[PDB]
């Protein structure tokens, strides 16, 4: 829905002569807790031989962002299994927070690839501090000096069905 980012660890159950295994951690994006948990178990069953019955959860913690309103360039390495074999992808965002960036990503993948939330994988978020190592261009053009641009053809959303005025946009 509207998204959150969560921190999870699983501590796969103490068996005799191997108590306290190695506390496998993930950072997982979802709107709530239990969805987050289920995705941890889903990735974990993929990544090594676990089941939920053979595993147990340590904690859930919402990861707030350190300095939200810092505008950030993010770059995200992802995978998705579309109808073909699975395949990788990188994308780049100018945005405010990790969570909002992946929100926009999920919708854009939905547009351009008919890509579902269920069949997306995130590998990784990263943040780029220095400019000019961003690979893409459509963010890169939003980085120039003394920037100005217009809102052409602005339209006003009236409640009424009539207008008596012969409207205009401006310009």
């Amino acid at each position: 829905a509207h998204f959150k980012e969560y921190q999870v660890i699983g501590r796969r159950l103490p068996t005799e002569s191997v108590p306290e295994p190695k506390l496998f951690r993930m950072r997982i994006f979802a709107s709530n807790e239990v969805i987050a948990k289920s995705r941890y178990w889903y990735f974990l069953q993929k990544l090594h031989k676990v089941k939920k019955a053979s595993g147990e959860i340590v904690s859930i913690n919402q990861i707030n962002e350190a300095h939200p309103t810092k505008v950030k360039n993010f770059g995200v390495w992802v995978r998705y299994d579309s109808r073909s074999g699975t395949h990788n992808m990188y994308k780049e965002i100018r945005d405010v927070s990790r969570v909002a960036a992946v929100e926009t990503l999920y919708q854009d993948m939905a547009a351009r690839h008919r890509a579902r939330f269920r069949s997306i994988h995130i590998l990784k978020v990263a943040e780029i501090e220095k400019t000019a190592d961003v690979k893409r261009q459509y963010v890169k053009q939003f980085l120039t000096k003394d920037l100005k641009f217009p809102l052409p053809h602005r339209v006003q959303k009236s409640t009424k069905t009539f207008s008596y005025k012969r409207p205009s946009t401006f310009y």
Binding site: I9, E56, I57, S59
Partner: protein
């Protein structure tokens, strides 16, 4: 609980909460185009009619 987890976070440790022992259950789907084993189940748990519900103790079985 809240003091414990606070103190464990101070300690660099993690409180695992008790796995809960009670649930509430609600029937959603109504009566028909049901498979029979679940029908028998719900007759045990008295969740016959729609938007009917109850408490249940938690265990393996």
């Amino acid at each position: 609980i809240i003091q414990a987890k606070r103190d464990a976070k101070a300690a660099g440790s993690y409180y695992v909460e008790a796995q809960h022992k009670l649930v509430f259950v609600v029937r959603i789907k109504g009566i028909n185009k049901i498979p029979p084993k679940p029908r028998k189940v719900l007759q045990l748990l008295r969740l016959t009619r729609i938007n009917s519900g109850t408490f249940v103790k938690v265990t393996k079985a």
